[PDB]
Amino acid sequence: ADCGLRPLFEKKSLEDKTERELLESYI
Amino acid sequence: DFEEIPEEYL
Amino acid sequence: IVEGSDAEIGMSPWQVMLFRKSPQELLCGASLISDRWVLTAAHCLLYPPWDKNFTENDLLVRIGKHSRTRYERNIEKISMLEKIYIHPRYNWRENLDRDIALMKLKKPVAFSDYIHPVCLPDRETAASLLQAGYKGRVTGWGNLKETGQPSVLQVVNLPIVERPVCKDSTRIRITDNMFCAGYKPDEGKRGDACEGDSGGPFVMKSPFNNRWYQMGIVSWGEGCDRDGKYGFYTHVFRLKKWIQKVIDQF
Ligand SMILES: N=C(N)N1CCC[C@@H](CNC(=O)C[C@H](NS(=O)(=O)c2ccc3ccccc3c2)C(=O)N(CC(=O)O)C2CC2)C1
Ligand SMILES: *[C@@H]1O[C@H](CO)[C@@H](O)[C@H](O)[C@H]1NC(C)=O
Ligand code: NA
Ligand code: NA
């Protein structure tokens, strides 16, 4: 419901150090 | 090398 | 995790540690899917060839952790299990087919900055994200090398591998309930789960709604981070109807 939205990252609009690598792979 | 956890759980 | 890096604080707030009561040891990873349900690999609990057959009272779950060995006072929550449910057609004799178990917590855990559930995929999310070359993320406190142990939670990002390449890497019979992941020997990047990471989550972040979904469960592999070998993962979506059946009924 609130699932999969991290309080210290998505909920604050902050990205972790390597999540971009995943996103860049989703072509 | 695990630190002991509170007694109630064991 | 082999060739990973230290996780950031709160990076994987659904990560769960399966911890044996006596002797005190790390058994496996697991994941938090709601306030009272934990998902893991069946073989973490039941594996007769190694005389492994754990019951509810043998184990604790530790949630919100970062350090492997420290008791993270005021941060982690330790829960007891009410009931374990193993897939009725878990195939431990041949190939670890349907390597999935649910664990119901005795009481709901409160969410926090460090404790938050991951989403389970629906058909559409699985269809669009489970594609060769797309990367997912594995986390755990398992060994750093096949033949030591990390101080904090480790993280590695790994691409999903095409099914024929998975099939041709092993003599084990692969099923539709598994997928494999990892770099090929020519790709010049490394990384794998290892002993102690089993039962942990393989997650992906949807670019549509920005949520994290658990697509896999660390299931098996031949050694850790061997060239030409891949990690195998239980296909969570293919087993979702069983998941929903157990949660609805119990
Ligand atoms: N390298 C990765 N990713 N993995 C997963 C985490 C542990 C990592 C290291 N673990 C291992 O190397 C041991 C074994 N590999 S195997 O080749 O012996 C094998 C494989 C498949 C089998 C299938 C059916 C029956 C017997 C099987 C036996 C394995 O992956 N297992 C699951 C586990 O360890 O939790 C053991 C239960 C057999 C390997
Ligand atoms: C595992 O343990 C349970 C509970 O004691 C028992 O009923 C069951 O027969 C065991 N299964 C195997 C395969 O040993
Ligand atoms: Na083969
Ligand atoms: Na490999």
**Residue A26 domain boundaries:** 1-27
CA–CA dist C13, C16 (Å, integer): 8
CA–CA dist C16, B9 (Å, integer): 16
- 3-class SS at C219? strand
CA–CA dist C66, C231 (Å, integer): 23
Experimental method: X-ray
Give the angle C83-C85-C86 at the CA atoms, nearest 5°. Answer: 145
CA–CA dist C198, C43 (Å, integer): 8
Domains delineated in chain C: 1-12+118-237 (2.40.10.10), 13-117+238-249 (2.40.10.10)
Find out whether C46 and C53 touch, Cβ atoms under 8 Å: yes
CA–CA dist C54, C20 (Å, integer): 9
Helix, strand, coil tally for chain A in percent (to 5):
35, 0, 65
Residues whose CB is under 5 A from ligand 4 (ion)? C 182, 229
Residue C102 bridge partners (DSSP):
C39, C85
Q: Pull the structure tokens for residue C26.
A: 């790390």
- 3-class SS at C188? coil
Pick from C37, C55, C35, C34: nearest CA to C45: C55
CA–CA dist C28, C40 (Å, integer): 8
Q: Domains in chain A: how many in total?
A: 1
Residue nearest ligand 1's atom 3 by CA = C231
CATH number for the domain including A1?
4.10.140.10
Considering CB atoms only, which of C8, C119, C137 is closest to A4? Answer: C119
In the residue annotation, C198 being an active-site residue is answered as yes
